[PDB]
Symmetry: C3
Subunit: 136 residues, 3 copies
């Protein structure tokens, strides 16, 4: 229920110090993304930080998009979610996948190099052709 | 535009004290989920709580996933949203549907037993097969 | 990869003072929505406001829904996101598209008339037919 998606590695630690993203089970809908950091980053309550993944994708098919969402436990239990809430990746975006991380909780939290911090899903998207009407 | 989805009832009050989820209209995209609580829960500004639904689903088809989102009025007018922002349910998750509720507002809010507190949609998902390239 | 969607203009400034929504590129997944305001609105940290778009859509096909999400830069860099996090538009909703805007940041921000403040995507949705089982 695949679609081949081209991926390029931007940081030499990817696949060496921490693995490439993989589906945990065959019924899994998302892939976990990990923090490609040189040093751990401490987020006080309310802070946001942009975390690199060391990866770039090229979806290429305009009928597909990817969405980045918070990991469920981390968001619910530690208040570690995305600063833009939900990240949308277009079929033509070819830059590095960067994760906006926001501490919406009451406690400081430290992101460690290689920690899984977000999940990404691939969903079909439709481009609307607007038909202007004066009344429905 | 259905797909039959297996559902199991975990709490005897479901369908008795509050009904099973149903689509409001035939053009409705989501189903409202209700709080299966013994007692009302009061959320001060900033608090989060995990609310049981008394329900479990088994999507089973790996081409489909479900997403849980805030109810629009409650989120915009009362600041009652999800602590993990958007909840993703995999085709192989078979445990109880649990809702992470967060009061992102300035006022306390009390969740009453049986109140509709989130909505869920079923969307097609694609599993990516990564093709490693050195350049796009 | 279109679907024709009926659109009705509710405010005479739309298409005159600021253009109708358009896909930036042919591989773009979302459309940016702009604030249809008479006066700029200043949001202090924590405030929410409901912003009209001057537009109404009628999806009409029950197999499609639209989702409204924060713009990535504005959400990550200025803390300007949606108060209901993610807005869902049903195939039968025919009222004006209204955007719940929340300042989740630490600074005040002023929304100017015509500014792009959210993005919308059209995604296929499936209506579940529940099959009650006592065990999976």
């Amino acid at each position: 229920m695949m679609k081949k998606i081209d991926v390029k590695i931007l940081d030499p630690r990817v696949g060496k110090e921490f693995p490439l993203p993989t589906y945990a089970t065959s019924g899994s809908a998302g892939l976990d993304l990990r923090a490609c950091l040189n040093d751990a980053v401490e987020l006080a309550p309310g802070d946001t930080t942009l975390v690199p993944t060391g990866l770039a994708i090229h979806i290429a098919d305009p009928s597909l998009a990817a969405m980045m969402l918070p990991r469920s436990g981390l968001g619910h239990k530690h208040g570690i979610v995305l600063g833009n809430l939900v990240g949308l990746i277009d079929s033509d975006y070819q830059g590095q996948l960067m994760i906006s991380v926001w501490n919406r909780g009451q406690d400081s939290f430290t992101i460690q190099p290689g920690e899984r911090i977000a999940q990404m899903i691939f969903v079909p998207v439709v481009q609307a052709e607007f038909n202007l009407v004066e009344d429905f």
